[PDB]
Ligand SMILES: O=c1[nH]c2cnc3ccc(Cl)cc3c2[nH]c1=O
């Protein structure tokens with residue numbers, strides 16, 4: 178059954194709640210982004226209105242085959258009226274098409290649902306500016322001070338320089354990047370751009386990227402693996418066995434594999450800066466784990482919440498254990514006491 182933190186009180190709206198059958202009283206289902214945990218349940222048989230970004234709408238229609246009559250894409254940063262309620266979609270700085278949702282309840286209550294997001298000071302100059310928010314449904318994925326990682330800029334700079342140096346030293350090296358889902362596309366796009374190559378990938382992954390409204394994708398992606406020296410593979414294949422098997426299939430065109438595993442936070446980030454990251458190596462294969470996060474760090478999350486000054490916070494991640502809930506409520510009170518709201 179649909180949990181409480183996916184319900185918007187005072188409306189007939191749910192958020193990322195497609196795996197609970199027909200939710201009681203839901204006139205419109207909002208989808209924050211196209212990640213499996215959040216769209217779980219949608220298919221060509223869904224017969225209720227889905228509200229989402231245009232990019233998420235492209236993915237629902239092409240990847241899940243949802244009928245167009247049930248897809249309601251909304252522009253970003255635009256006050257829209259949905260079933261008599263004013264709503265705004267804001268960029269969540271997560272994966273392509275990911276949004277936060279502002280709900281203007283009829284009784285005057287204002288609710289911000291972040292979906293999944295990586296907080297950034299640029300959000301302090303969105304439509305949230307000088308907007309009273311009474312309730313915040315917060316992506317609390319990394320809501321603990323030990324969760325530190327670099328900016329996406331620094332990680333991409335490390336990936337670009339690492340890939341460019343390796344391929345310049347060995348023109349016969351292949352660069353491989355692992356992928357879970359949508360998101361973190363900048364990793365393989367920036368590597369291919371510095372190497373003068375297109376990104377080769379499966380037809381299914383190619384189809385997914387064609388839905389993302391990225392300007393000039395036909396410039397950087399392709400399904401012709403032989404024409405590419407930057408290949409996309411499923412994240413599970415980014416291991417020594419999986420990469421050895423892939424290299425045998427390249428027809429003797431390459432004698433070395435440089436592989437990147439885009440991860441979230443890992444325990445290595447407690448001791449190792451991005452500049453000092455080193456790979457796992459076995460023979461002619463090296464694997465880099467790079468902390469490219471599309472979720473807020475603790476400090477980014479704290480800064481955003483202390484700026485927004487919500488009257489109530491409802492976590493949407495790490496809600497399953499009393500220890501996590503107690504830990505998160507303690508930090509919420511700390512932020513409130515320090516900031517003074
Ligand atoms: O949509 C999303 N789903 C999920 C699901 N499981 C996860 C497990 C671990 C970490 Cl670090 C991130 C996760 C995640 N992040 C997303 O953005």
Ligand code: NI
Pocket residue numbers: 210212271293
């Ligand atoms: Ni997500």
